[PDB]
Amino acid sequence: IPGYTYGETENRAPFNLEDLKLLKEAVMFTAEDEEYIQKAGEVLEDQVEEILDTWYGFVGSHPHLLYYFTSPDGTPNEKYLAAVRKRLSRWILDTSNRSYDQAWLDYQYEIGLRHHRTKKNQTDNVESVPNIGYRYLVAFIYPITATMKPFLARKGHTPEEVEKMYQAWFKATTLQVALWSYPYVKYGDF
Amino acid sequence: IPGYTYGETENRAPFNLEDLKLLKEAVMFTAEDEEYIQKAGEVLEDQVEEILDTWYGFVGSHPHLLYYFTSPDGTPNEKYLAAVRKRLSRWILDTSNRSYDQAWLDYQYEIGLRHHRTKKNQTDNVESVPNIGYRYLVAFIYPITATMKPFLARKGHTPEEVEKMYQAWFKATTLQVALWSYPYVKYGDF
Ligand code: HEM
Ligand code: HEM
Ligand SMILES: [C-]#N
Ligand SMILES: [C-]#N
């Protein structure tokens, strides 16, 4: 998967497993969610193509959001979208199956650097908008979780099991976006 | 309510009703949620005291989080907690009942400035920790929504109505925390 560099990033993340422990606590994330995040990957794995179409149908339906994938002329860079889409598919499975250890944290830093001006448009060698305004990364927590929800039901899991999978996804997504704020936040304020 | 200065803030917010429109869209917030956020205020209004005890029982159960309310000696400033608790009660009702207009946005800027080093500890004239690390404001989206959820059921509303109220709260909370990132984010990166 071109540009997917999990386990081979150049930089150590500025946060460690102790930062991670304390952040999982703020998001109420426990061993029970690790079980259910894993079970969510099992339900979503088959359905990944449809999820990405839904996710991109949301993004592309709003000009101010599709904007972050556009060429300087205001039109979508179809090469950009396609390369990023493959890495997004990976992130679904990584969120479900990786031990959230130092390598995981090193890749979280990297993904944050990629939405931010520090490394946006480098991974795919594209000319696009310089920075994704952070206000939108926070905002996106909600539609990421809403998009996942009907897919988690699709395999006829009970609504309780479904609820627990969704809550795990909500926590794990909130957790990640919080780490990704690092290159956006004033030094010392994170 | 001492220090509650909604409608009398010194500064115009650096974001306007156009920024707000575009952000509500990213969080999927529509006129349907405005109806249900309002109906949520009706269900939660009676229960505010219990909600604040639950919310503070979460915060106080984790040293690294209670930390942000402590005096320099590491012990909780009970005067701080009590003053802030009254303003938090207001925010429950404001989120449910205010038109999200320029005054609302001006107060969002203010609340963000208050968690951030810019104005933390000024409103109550207390000596406490200088800044609340932003990583935790994002993280808190989740426990704010989880704390609200069982209270929204308490009045024997159907689980559908309850679901719609919760989803409105999740969206409105995500929306607010995104605005509050402003004084934390590098200029031009928001
Ligand atoms: C909940 C918040 C978000 C999640 C979970 C998410 C997920 C992801 C993932 C997994 C990647 C690929 C990472 C990799 O390189 O391995 C990516 C990249 C990207 N995303 Fe997001 N994202 C979020 C916020 C946003 C927002 C608000 C936008 C604005 C439309 C956006 C647009 C983009 C763009 C343009 C890239 C490519 C960045 C580059 O040029 O390297 N994302 N996202
Ligand atoms: C979803 C995220 C959060 C929400 C919805 C929220 C809500 C609020 C509200 C409504 C106020 C009073 C605002 C006013 O002055 O009118 C407040 C203040 C305060 N909160 Fe939060 N908050 C969040 C994140 C956090 C975090 C992560 C902490 C860390 C423990 C925290 C601790 C505090 C402190 C210390 C104050 C007083 C700040 C000052 O000295 O002015 N909050 N919060
Ligand atoms: C990112 N989507
Ligand atoms: C703030 N609690």
Author numbering:
A (entry chain C), B (entry chain C): 6 to 195
What text appears in the publication on this structure?
Protoglobin (Pgb) is a recently discovered haem-protein with distinct structural and functional features that make it unique within the globin superfamily. The MaPgb* structure can be considered as an expanded version of the 3/3 helical sandwich typical of “classical” globins (i.e. Mb), with an additional N-terminal extension, built by a 20-residue loop, followed by the Z-helix, which precedes the globin-fold conserved A-helix. Residues belonging to the Z-helix contribute to formation of the Pgb homodimer, which is centered on the intermolecular four-helix bundle built by the G- and H-helices of the two subunits. Thus, in Pgb the access of diatomic ligands, such as O2, CO, and NO, to the haem is granted by two orthogonal apolar tunnels that reach the haem distal region from entry sites at the B/G and B/E helix interfaces.
The Phe(93)E11Leu mutation does not prevent the insertion of the Trp(60)B9 side chain into the distal site and the stabilization of the haem-Fe(III)-bound cyanide. Thus, the ligand sensing capability of the E11 residue, reflected by Trp(60)B9 conformational changes, does not require specifically a Phe residue. In the Phe(93)E11Leu mutant structure (three MaPgb* chains in the asymmetric unit), however, the haem-Fe(III)-bound cyanide molecule is stabilized only by the H-bond provided by the Nε2 atom of Trp(60)B9 (∼2.8 Å). Indeed, the orientation of the Tyr(61)B10 side chain matches that found in the MaPgb(III)-cyanide structure, but its side chain is slightly shifted away from the center of the haem distal cavity, its OH group being at ∼4 Å from the cyanide N atom. Analysis of the crystal structure shows that the mutated Leu(93)E11 side chain imposes to the Tyr(61)B10 side chain a slightly unfavorable location for H-bonding to the haem-bound cyanide (the OH group of residue Tyr(61)B10 falls at 4.25 Å on average from the haem-bound cyanide, in the three independent subunits). However, no intervening steric impediments are present for the formation of such H-bond. Indeed, inspection of difference Fourier maps reveals the presence of a positive electron density peak (∼3.8 σ) between the Tyr(61)B10 side chain and the haem-bound cyanide in one of three Phe(93)E11Leu mutant molecules present in the crystal asymmetric unit. Such observation suggests that even in the static crystal environment a fraction of the mutant molecules may stabilize the haem-bound cyanide through two H-bonds. The only exception is the Phe(93)E11Leu mutant, where two H-bonding interactions are expected from the dissociation kinetics measurements, while only one, to the Nε2 atom of Trp(60)B9, is found in the crystal structure of the cyanide derivative.
